[PDB]
Each structure stands twice: as C-alpha cells, then as structure tokens.
Amino acid sequence: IKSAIKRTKTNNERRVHNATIKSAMRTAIKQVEASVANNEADKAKTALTEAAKRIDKAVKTGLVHKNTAARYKSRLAKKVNGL
Amino acid sequence: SERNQRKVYQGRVVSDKMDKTITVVVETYKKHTLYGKRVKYSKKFKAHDENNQAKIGDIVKIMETRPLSATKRFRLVEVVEEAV
Amino acid sequence: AVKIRLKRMGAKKSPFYRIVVADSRSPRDGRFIETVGTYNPVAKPAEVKIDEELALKWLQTGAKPSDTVRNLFSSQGIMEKFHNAKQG
RNA sequence: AAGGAACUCGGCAAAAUGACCCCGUAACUUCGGGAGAAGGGGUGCUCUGUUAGGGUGCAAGCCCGAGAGAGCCGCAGUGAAU
RNA sequence: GGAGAGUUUGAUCCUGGCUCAGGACGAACGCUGGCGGCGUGCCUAAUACAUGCAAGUCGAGCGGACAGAUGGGAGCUUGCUCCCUGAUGUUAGCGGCGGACGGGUGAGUAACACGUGGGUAACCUGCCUGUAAGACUGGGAUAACUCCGGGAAACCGGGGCUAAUACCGGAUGGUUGUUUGAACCGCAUGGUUCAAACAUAAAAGGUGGCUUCGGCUACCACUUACAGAUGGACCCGCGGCGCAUUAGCUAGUUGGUGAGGUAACGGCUCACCAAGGCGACGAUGCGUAGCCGACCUGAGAGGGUGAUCGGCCACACUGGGACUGAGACACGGCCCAGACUCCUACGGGAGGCAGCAGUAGGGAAUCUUCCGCAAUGGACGAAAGUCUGACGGAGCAACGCCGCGUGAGUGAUGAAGGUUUUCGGAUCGUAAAGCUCUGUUGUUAGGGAAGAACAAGUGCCGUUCGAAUAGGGCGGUACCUUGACGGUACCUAACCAGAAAGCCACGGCUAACUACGUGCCAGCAGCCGCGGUAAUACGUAGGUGGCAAGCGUUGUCCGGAAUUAUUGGGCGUAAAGGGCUCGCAGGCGGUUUCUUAAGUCUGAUGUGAAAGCCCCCGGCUCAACCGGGGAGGGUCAUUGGAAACUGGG
RNA sequence: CCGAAGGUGGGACAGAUGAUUGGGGUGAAGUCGUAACAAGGUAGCCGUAUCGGAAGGUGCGGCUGG
Questions:
Q1: Degrees (nearest 5) of the Cα angle C41, C47, C53?
Q2: For labelling, which of A35, B7, C31, C48 has a CA lying 20 to 30 Å from the CA of C88?
Q3: Which of the other chains make 3 or more beta carbon contacts under 8 angstroms with chain A?
Q4: CA-based angle A39:A44:A50, to the nearest 5?
C-alpha cells in the first residue's frame, strides 16, 4: 500500500540472488569436506582456495559477516591441514 | 592501563557430583528495609573445577567469568581451607 | 548520527530551547547524551547561553549541528574556534 | 454398497480386540488393588555387523541379538493360524 | 513537625470496634455557571472500524518518455499545421537511501522485564567525524519501452531491446584464515604489538570550471583498515507481590567430550556418557501485575498509585515463519494458518486505526472527520526544495490549578416589603433608593509585537586544495528574504452599574435559628439517632454560617487509627501463654587479651539522566507556570583510614 | 527434519447451574417448656460418652470463674 511494493519486489530479487551466492558458498565448503573425507591433497587445496574465494566474495557483497566467515574458513583450514 | 576487575567471592562447596564443577554457598548477609535487623541468606553458585580438585565442605574463592554453560558463570581461584 | 540540536522546553505560547547533544534517532524532547546551555528566542533582545568548551568537545568527535544551532555557535563564535582548530 | 442396534424380551448370535516391546493410566480403595484401567506408538526385509553386549571354548568356530542409522518394497509387515 | 469527637452504663473507668471532622483525583453525578493563563481530557472492550490523511525522497546514479522552442525550413485560406535538439519544466521504471526513527497501546510478561551497580580477554554498530592507503581492466543480463498470450479483476507469462553509482568476472591490497618466529602482559579460557609466506577480499562514478583533448582539479559519492562517537547485544550482585486450604518440582532438565549454530558465550541446537539440578532462605503451581523517575497522603516511618511528562520493555486482528537491510524476525513490509469484513464473471482476490481526527459498541464517564510545516526536530537531496496527523497551533469540556470579576465611596426615611414579636419593637440594614464616581471586565473603533535564528542567493576578507588569480570547500562579516496561529496576546480612545452567584448547612461533633405545616405519616441520617399535636434534626419561609464560579453528593486512596504498634500496642480477670516435654534448623552469647576487618563509622572517586519535590534568583501585569543556579536521595561500585562494639581466628 | 493450527484421548483446575437437602442470620406481642443469671429453686462450666420434642438430663474426670 504505502509504496513498499518496490521494496517487496527488490526484496524478492535480492532474495533470489543472495540465495544463489549462499548456495554456491555452501557447495564449495561441502566440496572441501568431501575432499577431506576422501583423503586427497591437491584437489582439497584447490577446493579450499575455491571455498575461501566463495566465502570472502559472499562477505564482500552481503550478509555472511567476517566473524562467521572466519568460523567457516578456520574450520576448513584446520580440516585440510589436519591431513 | 590495567583492565577492569571481575567480581570475586569466597564460599563453601555443597556438591562435587557434577562433572568438573561444584556449587558454592556464599553466606554474605544483610539487613531489612523495615525492621533493620541483619538476617542471613545463602547463595549457591555454579563454579568450574577444571582439575576437579575440590571436596564438600571446602572454603574456596571463585572468580566470575563468561557463562561457561547453563547456570555456570564462575571458576576457581584459590582453594583456601580443606574439609576435615 | 550525533547531532547538537535544540530541545524544546517551556510553556505553551512561550518556547525555550536547551541546546542538547542528541541523536537523530531519539525524540526531540526525549533522551539525550549531554547538554550545553540554552536558547531564549522569546526575549525581545538576544540571550543565548552556550557552554563553549564542551560544545567544542562534541564538535570534534563528530557531531554536526542543525542550522539554527550552527548559527548560534557562530553568534557565540565556536565555529571560528573549530575552524582555527582545523587550520591547526 | 449406504446405514449402522433402527432388530430385539434382551447386542442372543455374529462382528470387533486378541502376540511381543515401549509410553501412559482415573474414580474409589480394606492400601494390596482397580490394572493387561483406559488411550497411544513400533514391529517386515537389506546393508552398516560373525556388532554393542553376553554363553561355551585355550583359541578357532558355534548359539543368543538390545539398540541405532541409513535405505528398499507392498493396500497391508504379530502380512497365515490362534 | 504530631489537636480529636460521638457511641457499650442507672452512673463510671478501662479494653474494643464502628462513625465523623482533612487532603487528593485522567474522576463521574446533581444544582449552578463570567472571562483569561497554564495543564489535562476512553481508567471501560488489547471491542469492531466507513472516510481522510499518518513515509517518502534524490534527474548532480541510470535508460526511456512527455512537453517546449533558440535558431532551420515547410504548405496554403491569414485561420493556421510541422520537424530539426536550445535552455527549460514533468517523472510510470531501474537504482540508492529511508521505511527498524518518529507517533499509539499496556493485552502479555513475576524474570535480568525494570531500577541500581558492575563485568564482556565473548560481542555487533549504517549514517557522522579524524587519519592512512586507494580507486585499475573487462564482461554479461534485466525493468522501462514495445509485440504477442492469458486473466472478472488482482495481475501474470512468452519472445524482442537497453543503461547505470545495478549485478558479475579480473588485476592490485597492511582485512580475514592458515603456518612458522619473536617481544611484552594477564583473570582460567587468554591479551596486545612486530615480521614472513600461503589463500582470497576491494572500489563507481556524477556535477561545475579550467584546457594543448592525453588529461588536471574541487565538491559529493565509492573501497579497505584504525580510532572516536553513537546506537545495539549478552551476562552477573542487589531490589521492588499475594496465596502453603500450592510441598515436592525438573529430564535438554543438571554437568562432561565432540560437532553444528550465533555478531558473540552458552543445552542455544544434536550425538555419546554421567545422575545430576531447585527446594521451607519457599522450588513448583495458581492469582494478580508493564517496571521506574515520579504522584497522592502522612510529623515521619510508611501506605496507596504507575494518568499526563521522561527512560527501558513488550505488543501491532491471533499463532508461526523467514526475507531484505548496518540494525527487524518489521504498527501503516512479506509468506502461511484461523476468525471476521468486502469484492467476484465462482476460478480467485483485497483488508487490518492499540498512528492523528472521527464512527459504532461497552460504560457513571472522557473531545475536532481543523489550520501549518512559520518555528524545533526527523528522512532524502549537492542544494533549492519535497514529505512529516511528530511537532507548532486551533476547536470542544469548570475536567483541574491559578488569577480578575458580578461594582465602589457616602448614605437613617432604619423607606416599601418579607420574617418574627411578650405587639414597645427586633431584624433583613447603609444593605436599597439619594448624592458622587471608576471601567478590569462588556461593547464599539483604531494602532500593533517578541515567537525570525535562518536556509538558499549574492558581494567581500582570511585560509586549504589546485597546474593555476579557474572553481569549490571551511570560518567571519555585509545585504536581501521567510508567520498557520493572526490583526491573536497587547496598547489606546468612547459609553452605561449597565451583561454577570450560586451551592450546601444551621441538635452535638461542627461555624450557623427562629417561625408555619406535618404528626412514628411524609420523611432525614455519616454517627449519636430525629419525627407518635407545642419538631432549632422532617418540608417551606426568613435568617445565619461556610465557601465561592464554584458548591454538594458519590466512588477509591492515605491520614485520623498508637487500629498490624520498626518508630509505636499487647496475653492473671477485657481478644491473646502452645497441655507439657526432648530437641534439629534458626536466633541470642560470661570474662581478659592479641589479631582480622565481613557488619559499623569516616574520606576520596564515579554514578543515582532531563523534568518533579526543596533552596536561591529571574521573566511572564501577579499567580499558576516558565526559566536559570544549586541541593537532596544507594545496605550502590572502586578505593583509603579507625578498631570501641557485633562477627572471624 | 523442525513446525503453527487442527484432530483424537485421558486427567487437573475454575465459574455457573441442579430435583432435593443441612446448618446459619433476620423478622409482625405465634406454640411448647424454663436450661442459665440469686443457693436461679438439682451450684454452674470444661472435655468426653450416652439418651431425650426442645432447652437439656445423666455418667466419668477436672475447675471456681461457689
């Protein structure tokens, strides 16, 4: 009613776009965990570079917030360097 | 610049039975709003024993801290007097 | 954010303004951080009272006054002191 | 089929429950009971597992098989019987 | 700074309750009613809402549009009609920022909700500052616009096209993570700073002016880090409630290890173990309740309240959820389910006044469907400006407080008339009329403030940038502007006592008395109690008394009430000693001395916001009220002295 | 997976209402006695049992508030 219809519209746009970025971030971190449970070194390292890339870009755009980004990066780093 | 000092108590151990912790009766005691006489109250706190070096009936100091779990906000400082 | 702004006090037909360091968020007569002195408009002459050093203290942490509070600072002369400090 | 005790002297007869495990359980009470009250849930097969855990054995290997996860089929897994 | 009185009796003294005299309301009711100032005005149904507004803005981010005509031509009827891109204005859409503030309500909520004091080495923070580094190189879509198609609408889908300060790659980065060295410091987890490498993580341009056309610069904006500031988070001590005719309550409950999750610590969430946790110092349960600054009463201690104003909280038709965004799980956003209202072409849609006005209902009961953004805030903008039911005002109500009124000086014929009378008079009583006179107010008519400071626009001057006197920022002047209230408060002149007083009581408490009617009837009453033919108690008249645009009644608080007694009461016989013991917890503890410092006292520091009570001055014609300045209030935290007493050894 | 609502079920608390009932209070000079107050005409009362239209009586123990 009170011309928040543009905020509803762009809210749905940013919802869809941010969910793409979040899901790519999730699949990258999950790819790291899959290449740690399988005991690979080189693919795990290139997956960690990919995952930290996804995490820092998701922080650059929006709402992942370097504290929780640091949580994800730190656990993925400890689990690749635990090999 | 020495940082701000946390709250400290001394007390008496009620129980040892929880894993790596105790509870502590602080017996600080105070007067009324109306009749003025000074009456006593016992406050038992949940406190962390990381070495579990405690016994029931032990005079002990505790430091306050960040919340260590549900109901825990305290840890040991100096186990002063042991039970007999 | 932090703004030195007038704050309404007084009767109905006779206003009065305490020059008051508040946020833009907070209500006009509501909560506020600290105050410097006063402002009588309804005197037929002048009569502003500004603390002139604690106001200066709030200007430098970053607190931009409203237009009438700014020109009251100019009338007592604290914006010139602030410009001398920035030229320092 | 639909209805469901309208049958009837009267739910007579028939139908329905009907195993094992877990949960939960009233009035009253002579304190024991009531009580299997009631009312619910899960029960197949497969792989994790010759398992967790026990019995025998000196060990091998034989029995007994709670619990969980994953999954697979069916309208239906105490798939019949009682 | 502290008042009592009636009532148990034939009479009395105690005990003892009851009743009264006071002050207050967001009060209502009844009678009555003049103005001005300032405040307040759904306490009830957190009942339901017709309508109107209550959140938009930026063309200096962007693409397309609509107009418009500086010049340029066009065709003729002298009536007219285009097409090039001038300035110039208008803004569906993208986009950014705001919508999370401001305004309402008190339903929930008995615990970190709040107050007060802390802790965070366990945290987040857009816009704002200040400083430091930067800002390169490309890419692909999309709204609008069209062209279809589907819909009753709400609107939706398909193909085309297009830009950004939109989005996405990419480079460079002192963030963040990892790994290795150091250095110093704590309160257990740990903290701060230095270095190296590895992995990534940026960014955007727009306006003006200068120009050799490469660029260069200011302003705004963009990115990263570090501070400040501000807002937010979580955690702990203390504190503020009724019931025990609520005694047992828990099981993610109580801990552990590990993981996830969070801005962060955490059973916050999950696996696996352990049997814990709260408890008569009142757990749990039930009932009630927003908390506070404050407000009313009181000598005070207290008791009651939680309206306005201000802080924090929680809520948004009911329950749940997330989205986006720095910050929401969002009053005027979204998705879902329920009830209700509405529309429907029956397929499906829309809605949420506990925002300002107003309506209906409930009720003893509380207002205008108003003017303005002039002032103070907000949002956006570079600004002009726009939006703003916040806010300024205005209207209604004696709803409260306060101030001025309805006349004044003189006046004995004590006039008329009332009421009473032992009929001598007394009284209404100098009160009317007589004389004299004012105009606050009433009215008419003129004059007319403070509330305005500004913003922006010019000109200067100093100064920082600059390749530069461009040009812009910053500061000081020096002008031109801006009022809804409103020709309102206010001042000045003219006129007439002319327009302006009521309510309650009169036995005592309790100030104030007679007469006539009534006859235990009508009725009064707060109590003692009146009234049954001589009623100062009923009804009326006169009078008096109290107050006064108020007065009286009611409803609740508090006092009186020493009637919950801490201040400040009691128990032989008035109410009250358990039938008595043994004793757990609790309370209390003879003496001398040393020591400690929890209690106690004292100092310093911070703090208990603003308003309020109080003191001192100031301004409204005084007052209410406003304003300034101070004080006060903590069993509060840290810190320092004392050691008599209580406690500790 | 969680999950609001809804559904089924058995309990818990709380308010109404209910034929009938039991005690209580107050009321126009109602009926029966007269239990208490005096040595109240059987001293009274307390506890307890029992009986009786009813106050009450009687037993036992206690008390003077004979």
A1: 110
A2: C48
A3: none
A4: 160
Distance in angstroms (rounded) separating the CA atoms of residues C4 and C20: 6
Structure determination technique employed: cryo-EM
Nearest alpha-carbon partner for A64 in A55, A77, A73, A74: A55
Q: In chain E, which nucleotides are within 7 Å of a protein Cβ?
A: 37-39, 55-56, 93-96, 98-99, 101-103, 118-130, 167-170, 175-179, 186-189, 199-203, 224-225, 228-231, 234-240, 253-257, 259-268, 274-279, 281, 301-303, 309-312, 323-327, 330, 332-334, 351-352, 375-379, 390-394, 450-455, 462-464, 474-477, 566, 586-588, 598-599, 609, 619-620, 625-629, 635, 638-639
Nearest residue to C56 (alpha-carbon basis) of C4, C5, C1: C4
Q: The tokens of C31 are what? A: 């909560």
**Beta-bridge partners for B72:** B46, B69
Resolution (A): 3.1
Q: Which residues pair with C22 in a beta bridge?
A: C3
User: What is the Cα–Cα distance from B61 to B24, expressed in whole angstroms?
Assistant: 9
The sign one gets for the Cα dihedral B27, B14, B7, B62 is: positive
Question: In the structure encoding, which two tokens stand for residue B10, read together?
Answer: 């001394």
